[PDB]
Amino acid sequence: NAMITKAIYPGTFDPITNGHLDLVTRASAMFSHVILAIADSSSKKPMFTLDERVALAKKVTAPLKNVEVLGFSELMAEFAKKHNANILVRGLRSVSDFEYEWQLANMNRHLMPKLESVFLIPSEKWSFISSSLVKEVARHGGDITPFLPKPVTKALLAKLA
Amino acid sequence: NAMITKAIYPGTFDPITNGHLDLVTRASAMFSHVILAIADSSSKKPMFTLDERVALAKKVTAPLKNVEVLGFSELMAEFAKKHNANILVRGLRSVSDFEYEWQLANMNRHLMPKLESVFLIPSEKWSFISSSLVKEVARHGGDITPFLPKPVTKALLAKLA
Amino acid sequence: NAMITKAIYPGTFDPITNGHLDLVTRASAMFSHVILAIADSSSKKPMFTLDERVALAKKVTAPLKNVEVLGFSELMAEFAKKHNANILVRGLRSVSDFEYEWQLANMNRHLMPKLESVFLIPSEKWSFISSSLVKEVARHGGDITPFLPKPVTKALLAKLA
Amino acid sequence: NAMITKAIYPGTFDPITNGHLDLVTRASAMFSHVILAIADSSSKKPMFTLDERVALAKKVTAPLKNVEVLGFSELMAEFAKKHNANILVRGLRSVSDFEYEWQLANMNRHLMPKLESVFLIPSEKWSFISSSLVKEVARHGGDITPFLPKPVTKALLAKLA
Amino acid sequence: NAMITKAIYPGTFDPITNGHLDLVTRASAMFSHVILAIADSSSKKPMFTLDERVALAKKVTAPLKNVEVLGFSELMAEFAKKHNANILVRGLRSVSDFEYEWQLANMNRHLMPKLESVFLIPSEKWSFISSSLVKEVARHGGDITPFLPKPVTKALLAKLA
Amino acid sequence: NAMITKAIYPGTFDPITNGHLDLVTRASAMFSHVILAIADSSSKKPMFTLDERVALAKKVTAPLKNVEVLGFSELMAEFAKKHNANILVRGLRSVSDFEYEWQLANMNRHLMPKLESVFLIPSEKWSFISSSLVKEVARHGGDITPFLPKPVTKALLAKLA
């Protein structure tokens, strides 16, 4: 019995990393449709504007047919309801991640009871990768090429040099 | 674009709890087909024989149309391959759970690279519930009715009284 | 042998949540007198002024006879000494909470050796509730009524709308 | 407004350590009456019989006027109800401890809703001390005198030599 | 100012894994001399006898000039004192590991104050690898070749087939 | 076979605490040479300027012959390469520390593959000590003398009074 599963994968993606890419690629294999959903996150003062983050995520998800990249600024749950998504995908890289995802998953069960939160663990290759430490390394001209897709490295380097 | 997602939900289920039931019910809503897969687990010396555990899981999953209950004794990954499952569902109740699931998910990526492990957090109602503590409470005639489906409570009480 | 136990329950309470209320209600049942102690916390830039937070905590603790609400800006330990409190009550919602409470409890043992720190775990109903995520949800008009006492919801909604 | 607070401090205490002693001493200062409650724990196969563990705990709690030592084999919650205790005291030495205490506290809220579970963190002097590692060190004639009260060291050494 | 640093790396090594090998290789690069120290561990009922575990560790550490493999059954601290070691090397694969190592490091500071405990994190390649799960996978004929040195895989397979 | 081990111990040290001092003293006993390396950390807005932090660390490490104090603002890995250090020493006070050190150690393995990261656990005396909580206590005139070397206490008190 075939089904349409529509999933959202929301985050700040500032910038999208090899870790994010691994997760959305796996979500893409599992669900009928995936929205890679980029939170405006204004109060976080992101390095990249929302438009830049949308452009970068489009470049790296281009080969995934059933993935669409969209910017949003409302609650992730309202965004899911707006797009008729029934699954919310989140990454769990470690124990510190777990606390917050548990709180958030419970909040979201209250806000949208039929939205199911599901968690994916990145491959051990990428699991230690953190947008913030990569940005800190790049600020000092350290080599970050192992952690970011090629077009993302190029934009991070331009944004700094 | 509709898809057939076939998931396995493996565990010892000795006995199946309200926590397990919440997870398989959610898996059932998300995937085309779910096998609730009961590990023989001989070296764990379960309270209930495999047959008893299969019978109890059938009683409590009866209303879920797309769920099938099966006993197995091989590796969970080989079991998934045998049944053409592409998703392995596991519960994460807390931080202690996370360590082991991370190790197991990585092992399973090696054994069956196209099998995707996905994690679900039980509702806060059930998250503290642990088959072992419930069994310990039942051994002393404590009331365990909040933690187990009714037929499971009845069989636990008979197995002890 | 009857005793006077005087406890302080200190925090930022910005705003007081159903979690805080559950803890102070339990502290109230256990100890002769409880001061719900609201830290000025200026460097945290709270959403609500100290006066507003005191007023809200008075509204929701009104039915607890042996609870008094007081604003303070000194060290919690000096505040306890000033009010002759022998017990300092803190909540532990999760593992992340534990680290900080351990550090703080040890600091406080040095500052006031006869002040005893004791920890309470909120009911599973409220344990995921975090003032910061509730405030984030409210900023977007999400429904926060399950997480806050009614007068607190009303003041949060006015403070934002 | 003076109150009678009756607390139970239950555990296996095999044997009672400097950590246990620090906790019961603090409980003794806070509550009207403390029962140091020693679980038979038969299925744990303790090093010391219940009688030996009761005798050792009596020797080290002798100076605490309001502490009574009692052996029990029922549920800790039924034991508390039997003795009219309204507080259940448990130690939290670290994060691993937290998981289990959370599960247990929630179970006990179901079994005895008016019994309040409260947690104490041992002094940094004793917090790493674990009955099992001390027993392992003693088996090889390592010096364990820093970790156990003097009469407990003496009985551990006799039980082994 | 050149120094002789003598380190011990103690464990059950049942059997030695790619994780153990990565750690001893790194210890070998850092210290003048490393004893890979294999605990008899009788009460753990190891899969491999002490002699077999010593032989396997010799095969895989053969290329490391400054490493010596020795079986022991006393306390690791007394073993270090016996061999004039001033450094005790332990692996930390995750958070669960941390609790126990902290307890053990503190115990060892008491038993041998001049012995320094130092911790190494395995490469992300090997960090999820656990002797017990590998043994469980091998029992069912799963492929374990990514996790063990070649001679260890060969002996594990003979020990089971 | 004697060796030159050159270690770096990098941090913000704002200000150097009894915990830092315990670690550098232990590093000093183990390695031929230790650079106590003080990160400019401009974006952290430290309480003490880099020069003040260098001066304070020189005062408290004066008795350690093989320790040198240096300020730096590049990546810790490039700093190590610049000074020919082969060991990077970091403290692990608790579980929360572990997450970040794991990420950082993995980043540093990429940036400088022959630099070995090694971890030390402070003595239980100092393990709860956190520069930030000490600074918070000092701001209110709480007694911080147990947590800081005497010259550091004196400079913290002048910097505030």
Residues 6+ apart with CB under 8 A from C25: C64
Pull the structure tokens for residue B93: 């109740």
Whether the CA torsion A145, A148, A151, A157 is positive or negative: it is negative
Q: Within its chain, how far is the Cα of F41 from the centroid?
A: 13
Which residue shows structure tokens 């992340």? C96
Closest approach of A131 to chain F, Cα-based (Å): 11
Nearest to D111 by CA among B140, B155, B149: B140
Cα(first)–Cα(last) distance of chain D, in Å?
Answer: 54
Please, what CATH class does the domain formed by D1-161 belong to? alpha beta
Phi/psi region, residue C41 (left: phi>0; alpha: psi -120 to 50; beta: rest), is left
Contact F94/A at CB under 8 A: no
The answer to whether D53 and D38 are in contact (CB under 8 A) is yes
Which residue shows structure tokens 């063990």? E148
| Beta bridge partner(s), residue A39 | A72
Q: What are the φ/ψ torsions at residue C83 (nearest 5 degrees)?
A: -90, 15
Q: Do B111 and E142 touch (CB under 8 A)?
A: yes
Nearest to C56 by CA among C103, C98, C15: C15
Q: What are the φ/ψ torsions at residue D33 (nearest 5 degrees)?
A: -145, 140
The answer to whether E8 and E112 are in contact (CB under 8 A) is no
Q: Do A119 and B116 touch (CB under 8 A)?
A: no
Which residues of F sit in the known binding site?
Answer: 12-13, 20, 44, 76, 90-93, 101, 126-132
F-contacting residues in D 98-127 (Cβ below 8 Å): 124-125, 127
Residues of E in contact with D138 (CB under 8 A): none
Q: Report DSSP state, residue B35.
A: E
Q: Which residues of E44-82 are buried (b: 16+ CB within 10 A; e: fewer)?
A: eebbbebeebbebbebbbeebebbebeebeebbbebbbe
**Catalytic residue at E131?**
yes
State the catalytic residues of D.
20, 44, 93, 131
Residues 6+ apart with CB under 8 A from A37: A8, A9, A10, A11, A70, A72, A76, A79
Calculate Rg over the CA atoms of chain C.
15
Contact B63/D at CB under 8 A: no
Q: Is A125 annotated as a binding residue?
A: no
The helix-helix angle for C95-111 and A95-111 (nearest 10°) equals: 110
D contact chains, 3+ CB pairs < 8 A? B, C, E, F
Distance set, CA E47 to CA A64, E36, E115, E139 (Å): 47, 19, 30, 12
Peptide bond into E149 cis (omega under 30): no
Burial class (CB in 10 A: 0-12, 13-18, 19+), C146: middle
Q: Do C26 and D117 touch (CB under 8 A)?
A: no
Q: Residue D124: which of C30, C106, C117 has the nearest Cβ? A: C106
Q: Is C50 helix (H, G, I), strand (E, B) or coil?
A: helix
The answer to whether D9 and D89 are in contact (CB under 8 A) is yes
Domain ranges for chain D, please list them. 1-161
* Cα distance between residue D37 and residue D70, in whole Å: 5
Nearest to D23 by CA among D116, D86, D91: D91
Amino acid in position F5: T
The answer to whether D60 and D22 are in contact (CB under 8 A) is no
Spatial strand order of the sheet with D87-91 comes to: C67-72, C33-39, C6-11, C87-91, C116-120, D116-120, D87-91, D6-11, D33-39, D67-72
Structural gaps in chain E: residues followed by a C–N separation over 2.5 Å: none
Distance set, CA D161 to CA C79, D17, D138, D141, D154 (Å): 52, 19, 10, 9, 10
Q: With residue C104 as reference, give the H or E element that holds it.
A: helix C95-111
* Cα distance between residue C107 and residue B60, in whole Å: 51
Q: Is A43 annotated as a binding residue?
A: no
Q: With residue B72 as reference, give the H or E element that holds it.
A: strand B67-72
Contact E94/B at CB under 8 A: yes
What number of H helices and E strands is found in chain C? Answer: 6, 5
Residues of E in contact with F28 (CB under 8 A): none
* Cα distance between residue C36 and residue C17, in whole Å: 13
- Which chain E residue lies closest to F94 (C-alpha atoms)? E98
State the catalytic residues of A.
20, 44, 93, 131
Q: With residue B55 as reference, give the H or E element that holds it.
A: helix B50-61
* Cα distance between residue D125 and residue D128, in whole Å: 8
B contact chains, 3+ CB pairs < 8 A? A, C, D, E
Which residues of B sit in the known binding site?
Answer: 12-13, 20, 44, 76, 90-93, 101, 126-132
Amino acid in position E57: A
Q: Report DSSP state, residue D42.
A: G
Distance set, CA D56 to CA B134, D132, E116 (Å): 31, 17, 35
Q: Is A119 annotated as a binding residue?
A: no
Q: What are the φ/ψ torsions at residue E29 (nearest 5 degrees)?
A: -70, -25
* Cα distance between residue C76 and residue C89, in whole Å: 11
C contact chains, 3+ CB pairs < 8 A? A, B, D, F
CA angle B32, B35, B36 (to 5 degrees): 130
Q: Is E127 helix (H, G, I), strand (E, B) or coil?
A: coil
Nearest to B35 by CA among B63, B2, B70, B77: B70
Q: Report DSSP state, residue B70.
A: E
* Cα distance between residue A69 and residue A10, in whole Å: 10
Residues 6+ apart with CB under 8 A from D151: D56, D59, D60
Q: Do B103 and E146 touch (CB under 8 A)?
A: no
Longest CA pairwise span in chain D (Å):
54
Q: Residue A119: which of B26, B109, B119 has the nearest Cβ? A: B119
The helix-helix angle for F95-111 and A95-111 (nearest 10°) equals: 110
| Beta bridge partner(s), residue B7 | B34, B87
Distance set, CA C124 to CA B94, B123, B126, B142 (Å): 13, 10, 9, 20
Helix, strand, coil percentages for chain C (3-state, nearest 5):
45, 20, 35
Residues of E in contact with F102 (CB under 8 A): 121
**Catalytic residue at B20?**
yes
- Which chain E residue lies closest to F102 (C-alpha atoms)? E121
- DSSP-derived pairing of the beta strands C116-120 and B67-72: unpaired
- DSSP-derived pairing of the beta strands C33-39 and F33-39: unpaired
The answer to whether B83 and B112 are in contact (CB under 8 A) is no
Elucidated via: X-ray
The answer to whether D69 and D58 are in contact (CB under 8 A) is yes
Nearest to F120 by CA among D130, E3, C102, E101: E101
* Cα distance between residue A23 and residue A126, in whole Å: 10
